[PDB]
Amino acid sequence: GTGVLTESNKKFLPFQQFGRDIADTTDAVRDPQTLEILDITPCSFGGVSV
Amino acid sequence: ALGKLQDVVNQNAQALNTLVKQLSSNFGAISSVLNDILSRLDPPEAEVQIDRLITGRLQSLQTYVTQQLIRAAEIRASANLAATKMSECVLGQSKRVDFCGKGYHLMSFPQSAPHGVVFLHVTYVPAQEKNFTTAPAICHDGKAHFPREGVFVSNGTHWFVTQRNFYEPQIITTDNTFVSGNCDVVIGIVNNTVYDPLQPELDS
Amino acid sequence: TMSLGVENSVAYSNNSIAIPTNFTISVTTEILPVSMTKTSVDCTMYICGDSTECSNLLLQYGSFCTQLNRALTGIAVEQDKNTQEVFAQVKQIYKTPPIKDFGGFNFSQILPDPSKPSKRSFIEDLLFNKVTFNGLTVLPPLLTDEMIAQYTSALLAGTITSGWTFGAGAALQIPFAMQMAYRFNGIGVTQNVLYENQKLIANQFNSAIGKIQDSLSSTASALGKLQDVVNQNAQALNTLVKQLSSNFGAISSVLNDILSRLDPPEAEVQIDRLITGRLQSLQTYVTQQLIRAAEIRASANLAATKMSECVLGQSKRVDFCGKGYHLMSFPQSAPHGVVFLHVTYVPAQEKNFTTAPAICHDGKAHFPREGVFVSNGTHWFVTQRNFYEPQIITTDNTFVSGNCDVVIGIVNNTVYDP
Amino acid sequence: GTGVLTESNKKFLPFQQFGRDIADTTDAVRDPQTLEILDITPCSFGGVSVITPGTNTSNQVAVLYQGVNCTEVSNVFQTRAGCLIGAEHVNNSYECDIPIGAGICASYQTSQSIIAYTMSLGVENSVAYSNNSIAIPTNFTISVTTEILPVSMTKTSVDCTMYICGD
Ligand SMILES: *[C@@H]1O[C@H](CO)[C@@H](O[C@@H]2O[C@H](CO)[C@@H](O)[C@H](O)[C@H]2NC(C)=O)[C@H](O)[C@H]1NC(C)=O
Ligand SMILES: *[C@@H]1O[C@H](CO)[C@@H](O[C@@H]2O[C@H](CO)[C@@H](O)[C@H](O)[C@H]2NC(C)=O)[C@H](O)[C@H]1NC(C)=O
Ligand SMILES: *[C@@H]1O[C@H](CO)[C@@H](O[C@@H]2O[C@H](CO)[C@@H](O)[C@H](O)[C@H]2NC(C)=O)[C@H](O)[C@H]1NC(C)=O
Ligand SMILES: *[C@@H]1O[C@H](CO)[C@@H](O[C@@H]2O[C@H](CO)[C@@H](O)[C@H](O)[C@H]2NC(C)=O)[C@H](O)[C@H]1NC(C)=O
Ligand SMILES: *[C@@H]1O[C@H](CO)[C@@H](O[C@@H]2O[C@H](CO)[C@@H](O)[C@H](O)[C@H]2NC(C)=O)[C@H](O)[C@H]1NC(C)=O
Ligand SMILES: *[C@@H]1O[C@H](CO)[C@@H](O[C@@H]2O[C@H](CO)[C@@H](O)[C@H](O)[C@H]2NC(C)=O)[C@H](O)[C@H]1NC(C)=O
Numbered sequence: 056g057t058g059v060l061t062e063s064n065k066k067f068l069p070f071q072q073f074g075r076d077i078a079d080t081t082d083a084v085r086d087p088q089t090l091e092i093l094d095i096t097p098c099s100f101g102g103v104s105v
Numbered sequence: 106a107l108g109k110l111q112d113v114v115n116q117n118a119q120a121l122n123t124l125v126k127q128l129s130s131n132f133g134a135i136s137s138v139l140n141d142i143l144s145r146l147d148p149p150e151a152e153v154q155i156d157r158l159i160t161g162r163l164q165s166l167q168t169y170v171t172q173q174l175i176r177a178a179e180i181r182a183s184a185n186l187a188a189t190k191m192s193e194c195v196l197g198q199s200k201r202v203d204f205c206g207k208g209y210h211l212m213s214f215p216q217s218a219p220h221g222v223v224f225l226h227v228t229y230v231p232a233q234e235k236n237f238t239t240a241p242a243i244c245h246d247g248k249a250h251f252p253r254e255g256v257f258v259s260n261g262t263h264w265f266v267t268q269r270n271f272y273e274p275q276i277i278t279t280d281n282t283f284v285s286g287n288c289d290v291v292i293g294i295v296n297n298t299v300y301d302p303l304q305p306e307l308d309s
Numbered sequence: 310t311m312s313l314g315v316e317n318s319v320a321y322s323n324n325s326i327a328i329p330t331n332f333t334i335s336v337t338t339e340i341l342p343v344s345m346t347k348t349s350v351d352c353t354m355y356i357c358g359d360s361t362e363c364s365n366l367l368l369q370y371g372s373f374c375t376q377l378n379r380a381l382t383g384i385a386v387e388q389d390k391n392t393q394e395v396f397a398q399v400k401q402i403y404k405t406p407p408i409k410d411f412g413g414f415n416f417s418q419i420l421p422d423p424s425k426p427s428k429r430s431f432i433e434d435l436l437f438n439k440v441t442f443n444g445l446t447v448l449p450p451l452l453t454d455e456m457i458a459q460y461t462s463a464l465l466a467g468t469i470t471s472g473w474t475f476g477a478g479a480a481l482q483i484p485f486a487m488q489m490a491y492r493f494n495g496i497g498v499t500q501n502v503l504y505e506n507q508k509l510i511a512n513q514f515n516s517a518i519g520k521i522q523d524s525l526s527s528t529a530s531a532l533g534k535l536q537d538v539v540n541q542n543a544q545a546l547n548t549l550v551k552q553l554s555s556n557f558g559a560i561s562s563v564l565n566d567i568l569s570r571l572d573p574p575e576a577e578v579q580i581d582r583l584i585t586g587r588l589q590s591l592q593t594y595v596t597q598q599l600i601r602a603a604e605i606r607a608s609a610n611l612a613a614t615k616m617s618e619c620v621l622g623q624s625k626r627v628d629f630c631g632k633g634y635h636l637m638s639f640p641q642s643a644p645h646g647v648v649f650l651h652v653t654y655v656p657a658q659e660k661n662f663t664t665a666p667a668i669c670h671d672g673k674a675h676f677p678r679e680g681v682f683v684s685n686g687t688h689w690f691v692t693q694r695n696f697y698e699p700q701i702i703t704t705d706n707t708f709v710s711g712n713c714d715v716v717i718g719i720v721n722n723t724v725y726d727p
Numbered sequence: 728g729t730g731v732l733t734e735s736n737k738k739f740l741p742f743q744q745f746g747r748d749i750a751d752t753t754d755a756v757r758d759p760q761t762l763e764i765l766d767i768t769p770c771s772f773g774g775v776s777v778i779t780p781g782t783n784t785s786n787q788v789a790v791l792y793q794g795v796n797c798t799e800v801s802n803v804f805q806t807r808a809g810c811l812i813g814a815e816h817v818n819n820s821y822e823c824d825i826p827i828g829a830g831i832c833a834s835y836q837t838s839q840s841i842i843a844y845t846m847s848l849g850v851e852n853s854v855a856y857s858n859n860s861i862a863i864p865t866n867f868t869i870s871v872t873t874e875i876l877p878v879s880m881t882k883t884s885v886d887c888t889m890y891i892c893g894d
């Protein structure tokens with residue numbers, strides 16, 4: 056995927072690897088190397104109006 | 106009460122949720138993710154699956170936009186109604202029945218609400234009704250008298266002329282009534298005295 | 310080349326007025342579609358009727374079927390709401406009294422008939438007589454036609470026995486002749502015009518209603534509005550059914566034949582063509598049904614407005630409640646629609662007179678309080694504007710303002726002092 | 728196919744094997760061995776709606792099998808909308824609470840249960856009409872009712888390219 060990874064305060068349960076939103080879009084992941092939870096946010100986009 | 110606005114919010118949210126959930130559908134393709142197909146299959150093989158995904162997602166987007174156009178036509182109808190009610194209920198007093206609430210409209214006050222407007226429709230509702238005997242006209246000296254603005258009522262023995270929407274009886278004189286005819290054509294005309302304000306004045 | 314009606318040069322001059330010396334009571338009919346049939350197409354059974362392989366292949370398209378079902382259910386609930394908004398405008402169920410002393414006006418042909426098992430009037434019966442399995446269900450409406458007739462009968466009874474008072478608050482009784490005198494005032498004609506012409510007006514009303522009956526009995530093009538709605542829903546459904554007999558590129562239009570002929574890996578390819586075509590056909594149907602239901606909702610909003618303003622009141626809006634000056638209206642139920650009998654005052658037998666904006670007397674100018682100055686050649690009278698009733702010009706008829714050196718067209722005459 | 732085969736009186740010509748309905752569906756078939764005509768009718772199907780009083784109020788549930796005769800599907804009601812199972816038919820008429828259809832509505836009322844009744848369109852009120860009797864109000868009420876009107880929706884712009892072909 057593509058996105059911005061930030062530190063997250065989500066309390067993952069040990070058996071859980073990643074977390075999805077209401078519409079089943081990946082919202083958080085767990086780093087396989089370091090068991091830490093990273094929030095994934097879409098890279099900023101928006102219409103350019105002139 | 107705010108169901109009308111909450112329903113609109115919910116409908117728009119549901120449409121967006123459906124649109125996003127449509128991104129997880131294969132639509133007949135091998136996978137619902139473009140990245141997986143691109144990373145696994147070479148372009149000559151992957152183009153068919155990507156075409157299936159493109160057609161499915163374009164149809165999903167078109168359905169969303171078309172239902173948004175139908176829903177926005179509905180919202181424009183409601184906004185035209187709200188603009189008319191602002192012009193007639195708030196900027197005026199409406200003679201239209203039930204346009205500005207049940208009752209006889211007095212005034213209205215706008216209150217903004219999220220993605221909408223709330224009209225506080227002040228109306229006059231007649232309350233405590235009394236039966237009376239009524240007569241279309243009144244015979245006095247042969248002439249038939251009809252109320253200028255009002256209705257002839259009788260509390261049993263006496264005849265008064267009152268305004269129609271609020272019982273305020275008054276003695277029947279020639280200022281209350283106008284004359285037309287000779288008491289032979291009216292169906293339901295009754296005999297009663299019509300006072301003359303000028304007569305006592307000339308007497309004294 | 311079509312003709313845009315007849316040519317007429319109005320006899321205008323700066324000092325001539327045409328005033329009607331008589332009138333007609335005209336009952337016109339206004340037919341408005343209110344609801345459409347509450348169909349509901351089972352998306353899964355239409356696309357993949359009794360086919361597990363097809364159903365699983367359809368699951369890959371996501372929530373297309375669920376959102377089509379949600380659209381059609383919204384349309385059905387909307388139809389029920391349309392009917393409620395038009396007809397359930399009366400809080401209670403009013404009944405006409407056993408004795409119909411309505412001043413000579415005869416509503417027997419619009420009031421409900423006890424002999425019929427339904428609470429249905431003669432004209433409602435005429436209208437109803439006139440207007441006429443692949444996952445495709447038809448939900449019944451919430452209100453039966455007997456309930457719709459009960460609603461319109463309560464509206465009629467409240468109107469006849471209470472005027473517009475029941476629209477505002479509690480129904481206040483008023484004799485129908487007195488209510489008619491009120492409704493005559495509402496259009497600028499004095500009460501005595503009703504009271505002195507009561508029998509003629511009542512007869513004109515009764516004859517107009519009889520002609521309504523005869524027109525309904527003979528010509529069926531009046532209910533073309535509601536029927537067209539019926540023929541459009543039915544036509545859409547028939548096209549939807551007939552789109553099940555299309556290959557859409559597949560070997561066959563029969564899922565059972567495809568399944569019985571092909572092994573699943575080969576069959577799915579043709580089942581996908583069938584699914585794509587049939588799902589596109591369902592989407593086309595549901596889209597046009599949403600557009601058509603928006604049109605019916607606009608029509609039912611108009612019908613609710615006409616019930617409120619024509620039936621529960623008297624409308625000063627022009628041509629909203631029939632051509633002419635609106636007196637009253639009567640709702641009649643019809644199949645998926647409503648019929649309003651708009652009773653209107655149409656002036657008749659106009660005559661020319663000489664008209665002056667003001668009358669000079671003692672130097673001061675006089676203008677009529679309510680009415681217009683007319684002259685039959687030699688004498689000047691002040692008459693109502695919609696019905697010729699000349700009156701001697703006195704100071705009760707007129708109000709003074711200024712001298713006679715300003716008004717253009719002021720004439721000289723005598724305002725008799727009472 | 729799949730359906731119910733009922734012996735029928737279709738006037739099949741000797742050279743005719745099956746009778747497609749207007750919808751070009753094989754309504755009737757000639758039995759190949761015994762030359763007899765058998766009408767085919769799809770096995771009973773319909774919608775299933777669930778009349779619920781609200782989970783907070785109760786967990787009791789009445790079920791409407793829409794448009795199926797009850798003989799073709801404890802309390803059972805044959806409404807014109809379909810077969811209503813689990814609602815007790817009541818002769819009294821109340822306001823419509825859960826609109827079932829065809830003039831019939833259901834509600835959760837008194838030991839309590841779901842009752843199905845013919846809806847009442849308000850209280851009957853004969854006006855005291857007379858050719859010389861008028862009702863005139865002696866007082867009034869200043870009522871402030873409320874009307875709520877939607878005006879705008881949420882302005883959404885969807886990038887067609889990024890939605891269909893994200894990156
Ligand atoms: C009808 O109204 C008239 C006048 O409002 C009543 O006559 C008056 O009644 C009061 C007592 O209620 C007396 O004090 C007055 O002297 C009466 N005046 C006249 C001129 O009669 C009459 O009583 C009312 N009748 C009914 C049945 O209500
Ligand atoms: C109202 O009063 C007039 C006269 O004051 C009544 O007219 C009388 O009617 C009777 C019977 O019809 C005749 O015998 C008299 O000759 C009439 N009198 C006059 C002067 O014409 C009239 O009947 C009264 N109306 C009611 C309803 O009682
Ligand atoms: C006003 O018009 C009505 C008709 O709309 C006239 O009533 C007709 O009068 C003629 C002759 O008297 C009768 O033959 C008809 O039977 C009447 N028709 C109805 C329906 O009653 C009435 O006379 C006219 N009045 C004036 C003053 O012109
Ligand atoms: C109201 O009109 C109806 C029909 O126009 C009248 O009913 C007719 O009455 C006559 C007797 O007066 C019968 O000969 C007819 O057969 C009836 N026709 C129908 C269709 O019922 C009714 O009488 C009128 N109302 C009043 C009070 O006269
Ligand atoms: C205009 O109307 C007036 C008022 O009716 C007419 O004057 C009366 O005419 C009748 C005959 O039609 C006479 O019997 C009256 O004596 C007249 N009254 C007066 C006060 O003169 C007048 O004739 C009408 N003029 C025209 C040209 O129609
Ligand atoms: C209406 O009457 C007034 C007076 O009664 C007329 O005014 C006269 O006008 C003439 C010509 O302009 C003058 O010579 C007189 O002196 C005026 N009289 C007065 C008393 O000022 C007026 O002309 C009349 N209007 C019409 C249209 O005939």
Ligand SMILES: *[C@@H]1O[C@H](CO)[C@@H](O[C@@H]2O[C@H](CO)[C@@H](O)[C@H](O)[C@H]2NC(C)=O)[C@H](O)[C@H]1NC(C)=O
Pocket residue numbers: 233865866867868
């Ligand atoms: C008209 O109605 C109002 C109430 O809507 C009446 O006012 C009430 O009067 C009673 C007794 O005087 C009081 O106990 C209440 O507190 C009053 N209510 C309000 C809101 O002021 C009024 O008396 C009625 N008038 C008539 C003539 O019936």
Ligand SMILES: *[C@@H]1O[C@H](CO)[C@@H](O)[C@H](O)[C@H]1NC(C)=O
Pocket residue numbers: 087088089090
């Ligand atoms: C992998 O090794 C790193 C040390 O570089 C350690 O921090 C991390 O916890 C290890 N992850 C495991 C054992 O899953």
Ligand SMILES: *[C@@H]1O[C@H](CO)[C@@H](O)[C@H](O)[C@H]1NC(C)=O
Pocket residue numbers: 234235236855862
């Ligand atoms: C008017 O009289 C009728 C006759 O019974 C009665 O039913 C009605 O309640 C009366 N109206 C009032 C306001 O008392």
Ligand SMILES: *[C@@H]1O[C@H](CO)[C@@H](O)[C@H](O)[C@H]1NC(C)=O
Pocket residue numbers: 292293294408410858859
């Ligand atoms: C009212 O109608 C009755 C018959 O119902 C009649 O006897 C009476 O004369 C009528 N009265 C008026 C004023 O029309």
Ligand SMILES: *[C@@H]1O[C@H](CO)[C@@H](O)[C@H](O)[C@H]1NC(C)=O
Pocket residue numbers: 320659660661
């Ligand atoms: C009024 O006079 C004009 C004069 O030409 C005439 O054409 C018109 O018909 C007259 N109006 C009536 C109602 O007779």
Ligand SMILES: *[C@@H]1O[C@H](CO)[C@@H](O)[C@H](O)[C@H]1NC(C)=O
Pocket residue numbers: 323324717718719
């Ligand atoms: C009407 O116009 C004519 C000429 O067109 C003129 O002679 C006459 O004075 C005018 N009448 C009025 C009342 O203005």
Ligand SMILES: *[C@@H]1O[C@H](CO)[C@@H](O)[C@H](O)[C@H]1NC(C)=O
Pocket residue numbers: 759760761762
């Ligand atoms: C065999 O089929 C023929 C033609 O349908 C029929 O006439 C005959 O009765 C059948 N006999 C048997 C053994 O089923």
Ligand SMILES: *[C@@H]1O[C@H](CO)[C@@H](O)[C@H](O)[C@H]1NC(C)=O
Pocket residue numbers: 796797798805
């Ligand atoms: C259900 O079937 C029975 C048996 O024929 C019949 O008597 C009854 O009328 C049917 N009911 C409906 C609603 O079709």
Ligand SMILES: *[C@@H]1O[C@H](CO)[C@@H](O)[C@H](O)[C@H]1NC(C)=O
Pocket residue numbers: 816817818
């Ligand atoms: C309702 O009333 C009818 C007759 O009025 C009767 O046959 C029926 O048994 C009643 N139903 C109940 C549940 O009491």
